[PDB]
Structure formats: C-alpha cells, structure tokens
Amino acid sequence: REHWATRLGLILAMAGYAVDLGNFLRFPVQAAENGGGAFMIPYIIAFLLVGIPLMWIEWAMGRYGGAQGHGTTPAIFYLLWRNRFAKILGVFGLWIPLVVAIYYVYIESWTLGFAIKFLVGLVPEPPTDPDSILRPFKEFLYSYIGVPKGDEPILKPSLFAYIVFLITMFINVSILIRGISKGIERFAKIAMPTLFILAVFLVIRVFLLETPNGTAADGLNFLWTPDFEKLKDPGVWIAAVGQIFFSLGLGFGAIITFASYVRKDQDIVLSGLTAATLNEKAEVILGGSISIPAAVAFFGVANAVAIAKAGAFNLGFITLPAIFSQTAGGTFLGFLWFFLLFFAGLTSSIAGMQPMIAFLEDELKLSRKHAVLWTAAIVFFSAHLVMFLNKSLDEMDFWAGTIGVVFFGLTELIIFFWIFGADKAWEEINRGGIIKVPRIYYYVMRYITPAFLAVLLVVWAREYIPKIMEETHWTVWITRFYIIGLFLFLTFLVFLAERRRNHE
Ligand SMILES: CCCCCCCCO[C@@H]1O[C@H](CO)[C@@H](O)[C@H](O)[C@H]1O
Ligand SMILES: CCCCCCCCO[C@@H]1O[C@H](CO)[C@@H](O)[C@H](O)[C@H]1O
Ligand SMILES: CCCCCCCCO[C@@H]1O[C@H](CO)[C@@H](O)[C@H](O)[C@H]1O
Ligand SMILES: O[C@]1(c2ccc(Cl)cc2)c2ccccc2C2=NCCN21
Ligand code: NA
Numbered sequence: 168r169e170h171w172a173t174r175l176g177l178i179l180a181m182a183g184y185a186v187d188l189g190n191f192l193r194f195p196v197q198a199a200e201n202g203g204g205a206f207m208i209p210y211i212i213a214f215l216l217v218g219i220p221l222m223w224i225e226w227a228m229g230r231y232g233g234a235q236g237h238g239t240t241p242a243i244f245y246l247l248w249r250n251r252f253a254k255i256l257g258v259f260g261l262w263i264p265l266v267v268a269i270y271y272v273y274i275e276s277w278t279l280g281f282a283i284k285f286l287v288g289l290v291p292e293p294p295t296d297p298d299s300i301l302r303p304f305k306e307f308l309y310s311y312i313g314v315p316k317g318d319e320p321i322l323k324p325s326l327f328a329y330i331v332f333l334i335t336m337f338i339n340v341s342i343l344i345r346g347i348s349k350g351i352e353r354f355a356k357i358a359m360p361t362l363f364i365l366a367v368f369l370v371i372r373v374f375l376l377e378t379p380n381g382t383a384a385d386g387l388n389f390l391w392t393p394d395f396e397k398l399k400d401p402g403v404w405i406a407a408v409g410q411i412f413f414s415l416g417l418g419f420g421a422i423i424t425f426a427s428y429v430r431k432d433q434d435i436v437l438s439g440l441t442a443a444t445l446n447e448k449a450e451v452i453l454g455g456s457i458s459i460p461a462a463v464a465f466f467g468v469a470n471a472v473a474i475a476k477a478g479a480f481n482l483g484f485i486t487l488p489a490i491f492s493q494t495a496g497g498t499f500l501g502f503l504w505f506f507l508l509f510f511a512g513l514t515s516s517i518a519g520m521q522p523m524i525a526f527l528e529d530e531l532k533l534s535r536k537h538a539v540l541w542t543a544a545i546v547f548f549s550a551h552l553v554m555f556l557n558k559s560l561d562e563m564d565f566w567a568g569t570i571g572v573v574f575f576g577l578t579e580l581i582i583f584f585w586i587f588g589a590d591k592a593w594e595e596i597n598r599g600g601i602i603k604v605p606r607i608y609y610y611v612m613r614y615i616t617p618a619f620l621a622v623l624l625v626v627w628a629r630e631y632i633p634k635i636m637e638e639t640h641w642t643v644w645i646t647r648f649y650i651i652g653l654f655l656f657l658t659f660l661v662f663l664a665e666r667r668r669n670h671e
C-alpha cells in the first residue's frame with residue numbers, strides 16, 4: 168500500500184485539503200454576519216465539540232481501514248459493521264466527493280483563468296461611483312462563465328474558460344497520477360509554503376491600503392468588534408457549527424481516504440490536531456485579514472454590512488478584482504489573489520478525487536494510472552452539466568456538498584462509536600498517539616458530537632429542503648436525475664467489487 172513518506176508531508180496534505188477558498192472568503196463573511204468578534208465564542212466551541220472530535224474519528228477510521236487494504240467507506244463501514252446496509256451507506260463516502268469534484272474543479276479553473284487574465288492584463292479597467300467600478304467586473308465574470316442572457320437556463324462558457332478548465336484537469340491528473348508520496352505529498356510541500364507566502368504578502372499590502380473612504384484598520388475593526396447580542400440567536404450557533412464542519416472538510420470521505428495511507432501504528436492524534444490547527448490559523452489570521460479589510464478600506468465602513476451580505480462569491484470574484492484595478496500594482500495584486508485561490512483549490516481537489524481513485528485501486532484492483540484516468544474521465548465528462556446548465560452547480564452543492572456531508576458525518580460517528588463500539592473506537596484513535604486524546608472527549612464523541620450534528624441536520628432539512636423542492640426551476644430535475652444516476656452506478660461498482668472478491 169502507498170504511504171505518506173514524512174510526518175510533515177502528511178500534515179501539509181491534510182491541511183492542504185482543509186484550506187480552500189472558503190478560508191479566504193466564506194469564513195470572513197460568516198463572522199461579519201454573525202457577531203463579528205463574538206462569533207469566535209461559538210466558533211471555538213464548535214471546533215472543540217464537533218470539528219476536533221470528528222476529525223480524529225475520520226483519521227482513526229481511515230488508518231484502521233488502510234491497515235487492511237481499504238481506503239474508502241463502502242469497505243471500511245463494512246469492516247466496522249458487517250451488514251449489507253453498511254456498504255450502501257459507504258457509497259455516500261464515494262458519491263459526495265465525486266459529485267463535489269464535478270463542480271469544484273471547474274470553479275477552481277476560474278481562479279486559474281482570472282489569475283492569467285490579470286497577469287497579462289486582459290482585465291477591465293474602469294472608469295467615480297462604486298457601481299461604475301463593480302459593473303465592468305461583474306460583466307467580465309458573466310462573460311467568462313457564460314451567465315444566461317435570456318430566460319433560458321443555458322450557460323455559454325468562453326473558449327478561454329473551457330481551455331483553462333482542460334488545463335486545470337490536466338494539472339490535477341499530473342499530480343494524482345504520481346501517487347500519494349511522489350504526487351500529492353510532494354505537491355503539498357510546495358503549495359502550502361507558497362500559499363503562506365502569497366497570503367502574508369497580501370495581508371501586508373492590504374494593511375497598507377488607504378483610500379478617501381477608509382483604511383484596512385477599519386476593515387479589521389468592523390470584522391472583529393464583538394456583537395454579543397447575536398449570541399442569543401440560535402442561527403449564529405448553527406452558522407458556527409456549520410462553518411467549522413465545512414472548513415475542516417468533515418464528512419466528504421477525503422480525510423478517511425487520506426488517513427488510510429497512514430501506517431497502522433503511526434500517530435494520528437497529534438498530526439490530526441496540527442492539521443486542523445493549520446486550517447484554523449489560515450482561516451482566522453490570513454483569511455480574516457485580506458478580503459474584508461480590503462473591501463471595507465476601499466468602499467468604507469458604511470458599506471461593510473452591504474459587502475458582507477453580497478456574499479463570499481461576489482467578494483472574491485467581483486468586489487476584490489474591482490478594487491485591485493483601482494490600486495497601485497493592483498494588476499499583479501489580482502494575479503496573486505487568484506493564484507492563491509487556485510492553489511487553495513488545487514490542494515483540495517486532488518484530495519477530493521482520491522477516494523474514487525482509491526476505490527478503483529483497492530476494490531477493483533485497477534492500476535493507479537488507470538484509476539486516476541478513469542476518475543478524471545468521469546469527472547471531466549460530468550462537469551459539462553455544471554458548465555452548461557445554469558444552477559446545476561448549486562443543486563449538486565446542496566445535496567452532496569451541504570446536506571450530504573453532515574448526514575455522512577453523523578453516519579460515521581454512529582458506525583464507529585456506537586455500532587463498532589466506543590471502547591474499540593477509543594483504543595483505535597489513541598493507538599500510536601504521541602499525545603493521548605483527553606478522557607473528556609470520550610463522552611463528547613459519544614453524545615455531544617452526534618447531538619450537535621443531529622440538530623444541525625434537522626434545522627437545515629426543515630429550513631432549506633422545502634425551498635429547493637418547491638421554488639426551483641424544472642431544470643433542477645436534470646441535475647437530481649444525473650447525480651442519482653451516479654449513486655446507482657457507484658452502487659453497481661461496489662456490487663461488482665464484492666462479486667470479484669467472491670471469485671478470488
Ligand atoms: C457531451 C459531453 C462532452 C462534449 C461536450 C461538448 C464540449 C463543448 O465544447 C465547447 O467547445 C466550444 C468551442 O467553440 C467552446 O467555446 C465551448 O465553451 C466548449 O464547451
Ligand atoms: C449537458 C452537456 C452540455 C452540452 C454541450 C453543449 C454543446 C452545444 O453545441 C453548440 O453549442 C454552441 C453554444 O454552446 C452553439 O453555438 C451551437 O449551436 C451548438 O451546437
Ligand atoms: C467560495 C466561493 C466560491 C464559490 C461560489 C461559486 C458559485 C457561483 O456560481 C453561480 O452559479 C449561478 C447560477 O445561476 C450563476 O448565476 C452565478 O453567476 C455563478 O457564479
Ligand atoms: O474544497 C472542499 C473540497 C471537497 C471535495 C473536492 Cl473533490 C474538492 C474540494 C470543499 C467543498 C465544499 C465544501 C467544503 C469543502 C472543503 N473543505 C476542505 C476541502 N474542501
Ligand atoms: Na477550511
């Protein structure tokens with residue numbers, strides 16, 4: 168079995184998995200909307216009661232499976248629970264990261280495309296008033312993606328966007344086809360320091376921003392001034408538990424799969440804690456110091472609330488690019504911003520495609536080359552739905568990327584700590600540990616963590632599911648149809664896997 172070569176490489180690949188575009192865009196917007204500095208109270212709590220416990224569990228489950236030659240959840244769930252229904256539930260740990268990959272690699276390609284256009288100067292140059300600067304960049308994005316100009320839900324990506332997507336798939340494959348240590352691990356040791364340098368440069372340059380409308384200090388101010396009155400709102404605590412769960416990449420199968428290349432008695436307690444910490448530091452220190460302070464510096468604290476409500480995507484793809492076109496050397500600044508987002512995405516997508524690759528290798532005995540190429544083929548092909556059908560992306564992101572992962576997070580806990588056995592699970596986590604998990608976490612993992620996840624799941628199911636089902640366009644059924652088909656196909660592959668095993 169492939170293994171991580173060095174402890175540092177393992178930590179950087181895992182941190183690389185967790186650190187993504189959300190760290191630099193989603194987290195700052197969530198924090199501003201949910202109590203500013205006060206948001207750190209439920210955020211740390213969520214990290215301590217949900218993020219950290221579940222992450223350890225996924226590492227444990229992964230390492231446990233890897234020791235027996237299985238890196239994915241259909242086989243691993245079955246090892247923890249010898250039941251047919253365990254294998255079927257395990258398909259979700261293959262289906263979730265596959266579906267997310269189908270839209271994520273494409274979004275990732277946008278950052279590469281924007282980076283290139285900025286570098287060579289193929290970007291708008293306004294002209295005054297805020298909308299006069301924002302609008303040319305809104306149009307730039309819309310022409311790139313091919314946002315529908317009619318009533319048809321049809322996207323028409325530019326030729327540039329399509330080719331960059333091809334290049335982005337190629338880069339992912341280039342890394343993945345080299346394997347865990349010589350591919351994913353090797354790239355982690357380059358990308359994570361590169362990521363750190365890019366962010367630190369941006370933080371310094373953003374902190375120097377001074378405009379007639381404000382400063383970066385005003386931005387840091389608006390973001391970090393506590394509003395403890397928002398702590399009464401349960402939706403702020405839901406937002407925190409959700410933000411932590413998504414930022415750490417829990418429930419995607421990626422962590423389990425990556426952990427399966429950790430040797431049987433190699434530490435996961437300290438390595439896991441360190442990886443999660445890297446993600447948090449990148450999130451609150453770097454992510455919180457770039458996008459929002461930059462936006463508030465240029466548009467003024469008066470528009471801070473409006474900026475936050477316009478969302479993470481507009482901030483990262485419209486607002487910030489517009490600001491850069493109005494700042495000195497902003498052209499090279501825009502390149503760095505999107506180069507940073509690209510590496511953030513790239514380190515996450517290679518990790519997110521590994522479960523499908525590992526399944527083909529482990530259960531269908533494909534060579535790494537064949538497993539990588541076929542996985543890429545399925546993802547490349549399916550992505551055409553995301554590129555050409557308006558709102559298809561959102562539909563996939565809701566079922567697999569939002570509802571899916573929390574359901575799968577809960578399923579993991581129950582199978583491991585309740586069905587497999589809490590005592591067997593606890594020993595599995597702490598074995599080989601450089602440090603031991605605090606005894607208090609035995610109760611957290613068993614009662615607190617699933618409770619939190621159960622509550623989040625129900626709240627979101629009651630809140631969002633009726634909306635998606637009743638108020639969306641008929642074309643959502645196309646996306647629902649396709650992704651349900653994918654689940655059928657993966658179930659069949661799992662069916663073929665157990666049949667081959669019966670023969671040999
Ligand atoms: C059917 C799934 C695989 C084939 C999908 C069709 C590929 C579409 O290819 C298209 O080529 C055009 C060149 O003019 C580009 O401008 C489009 O953006 C690109 O998507
Ligand atoms: C769901 C898979 C996506 C199908 C790929 C669309 C291929 C459409 O193909 C071409 O599209 C061009 C604009 O896109 C048009 O100029 C052409 O008339 C059309 O033939
Ligand atoms: C972390 C933030 C980056 C992810 C945000 C990408 C999601 C944006 O996807 C959106 O799909 C829409 C469908 O109607 C299009 O109209 C939008 O213009 C397109 O940006
Ligand atoms: O960027 C992801 C991720 C997950 C899977 C893939 Cl294939 C690609 C990227 C992601 C997407 C959506 C929601 C959360 C997360 C996430 N957390 C860590 C890496 N990662
Ligand atoms: Na993250």
Ligand code: NA
Pocket residue numbers: 182183184185186187510511512513514515516
């Ligand atoms: Na990443």
